[PDB]
Enzyme design. Structure first.
Site, short mmCIF file in Angstrom:
data_model
loop_
_atom_site.label_atom_id
_atom_site.label_comp_id
_atom_site.label_asym_id
_atom_site.label_seq_id
_atom_site.Cartn_x
_atom_site.Cartn_y
_atom_site.Cartn_z
N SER A 147 56.69 19.63 48.62
CA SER A 147 55.53 18.81 48.28
C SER A 147 54.39 19.15 49.23
CB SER A 147 55.89 17.32 48.30
OG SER A 147 57.05 17.18 47.50
N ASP A 255 54.98 19.47 37.18
CA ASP A 255 55.25 18.73 38.40
C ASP A 255 54.62 17.33 38.31
OD1 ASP A 255 53.98 17.99 41.22
OD2 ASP A 255 55.93 18.99 41.48
N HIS A 304 59.71 16.55 40.68
CA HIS A 304 58.93 16.82 41.88
C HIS A 304 59.92 16.96 43.01
CE1 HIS A 304 55.44 16.99 44.47
NE2 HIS A 304 55.72 15.86 45.10
#
Ligand SMILES: Cc1ccccc1OCC(=O)Nc1ccc2cnccc2c1
Ligand SMILES: *[C@@H]1O[C@H](CO)[C@@H](O)[C@H](O)[C@H]1NC(C)=O
EC number: 3.1.1.98
Length: 362
Positions: A147, A255, A304
């Site tokens: 991330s 995502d 994600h």
């Protein structure tokens, strides 16, 4: 015993946002010369008001005062081959994200700064301190992250390589593994001018963040985009071609953080034509940006992060799992493609969950 142990940095000038010391969690593997340094993610803040709110309800992302003495390694940070087929015997390092700056900042708390944004300096200081704890003997240093930490890999991998070269360790091979940090500065599904935190698109929020953090970007990318345009270097497809270290890119084609910043909020109601086309075009654009990325894993799923999930081995692209593709990447970097051991794995189907191995969400 799956546990990584906390070490606060000995250089107490390298701090989390509130001036508490930054740190790292370490599990050594005696006799392995592989080192995995993982950058945690967790969004970012970019002005006093939104950093103040983050300090109230996301304080572990801004301070080390409440960190636990140990953490369990999961996914690629697990030491069990059952859970981590790729690097289970490596030296494991988890670096908490406590700088709220996408790992880019180089500014201290001071009379003019309520918060310190030291993410780029935290990475350098962790590397420096590890050199005395065995990293000096390394053959491969894999800087990984998820991330905002995956974007952090892209922003910092070449600086780690440069640091080690300047300190006299040119034999340590520095490589990057960027998971879920390859974002697009694309047209959004609905648009708002940047008038507060929730309305501020990523390009605008990052342009403000860089000034607030004293953010730094990789030198070759900085030289291309120049003053005022360094926000461009936070977008993987723009910064990646400027990097010299080998980087493996993991990115879901749909995502969830990308969709959020695009102002797409799925609700289980039927998707009508405008949004269907929007989502399909998003997957096509992401795939297009990966066309020339030789080491990549990009499944057609709405999700994600992946690499520190315990079930990270379950997803496959074209019948190949991520731990397998990472192993094939290691083989490809030994001193021509490999039979049955691919490293470029990008789904071509056009809708989330068209790949049956996508995470279930359960
Ligand atoms: C580094 C970066 C570049 C481009 C795009 C995104 C990037 O970082 C991740 C990110 O912005 N994550 C989130 C997470 C939760 C959110 C909730 N609501 C609104 C916005 C949110 C944004
Ligand atoms: C401590 O960190 C600061 C900020 O990164 C740096 O300037 C300084 O040289 C460091 N001190 C030592 C002894 O490494």
């Amino acid at each position: 015993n799956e546990d990584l142990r906390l070490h606060l940095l000995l250089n107490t000038s390298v701090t989390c946002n509130d001036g508490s010391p930054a740190g790292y969690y370490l599990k050594e593997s005696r006799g392995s010369r592989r080192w995995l340094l993982f950058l945690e993610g967790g969004w970012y803040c970019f002005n006093r008001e939104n950093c103040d709110s983050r300090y109230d309800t996301m304080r572990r992302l801004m301070s080390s005062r409440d960190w636990p003495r140990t953490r369990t390694g999961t996914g690629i940070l697990s030491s069990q081959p059952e859970e981590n087929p790729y690097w289970w015997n490596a030296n494991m390092v988890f670096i908490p994200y406590c700088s709220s700056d996408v790992w880019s900042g180089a500014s201290s708390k001071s009379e003019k700064n309520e918060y310190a944004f030291m993410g780029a300096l935290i990475i350098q200081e962790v590397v420096r301190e590890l050199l005395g704890r065995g990293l000096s003997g390394a053959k491969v240093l894999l800087l990984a992250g998820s991330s905002a930490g995956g974007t952090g890999v892209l922003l910092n991998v070449d600086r780690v390589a440069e640091q080690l070269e300047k300190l006299g360790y040119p034999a340590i091979q520095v490589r990057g593994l960027a998971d879920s940090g390859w974002f697009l500065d694309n047209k959004q599904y609905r648009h708002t001018d940047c008038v507060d935190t929730i309305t501020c698109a990523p390009t605008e929020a990052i342009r403000r963040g860089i000034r607030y953090w004293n953010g730094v970007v990789p030198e070759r990318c900085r030289r291309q985009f120049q003053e005022g345009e360094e926000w461009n270097c936070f977008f993987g497809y723009k910064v990646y071609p400027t990097l010299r270290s080998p980087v493996f890119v993991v990115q879901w084609l749909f995502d969830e953080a990308q969709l959020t910043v695009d102002n797409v909020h799925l609700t289980g109601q039927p998707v009508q034509e405008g949004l269907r086309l929007y989502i399909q075009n998003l997957g096509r654009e992401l795939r297009h940006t990966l066309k020339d990325v030789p080491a990549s894993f990009a499944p057609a799923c709405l999700s994600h992060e992946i690499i520190i999930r315990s079930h990270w081995t379950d997803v496959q692209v074209k019948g190949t799992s991520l731990p397998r593709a990472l192993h094939c990447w290691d083989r490809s970097l030994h001193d021509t493609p490999l039979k049955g051991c691919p490293v470029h794995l990008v789904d071509s189907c056009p809708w989330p969950h068209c790949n049956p191995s996508c995470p279930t969400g359960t």
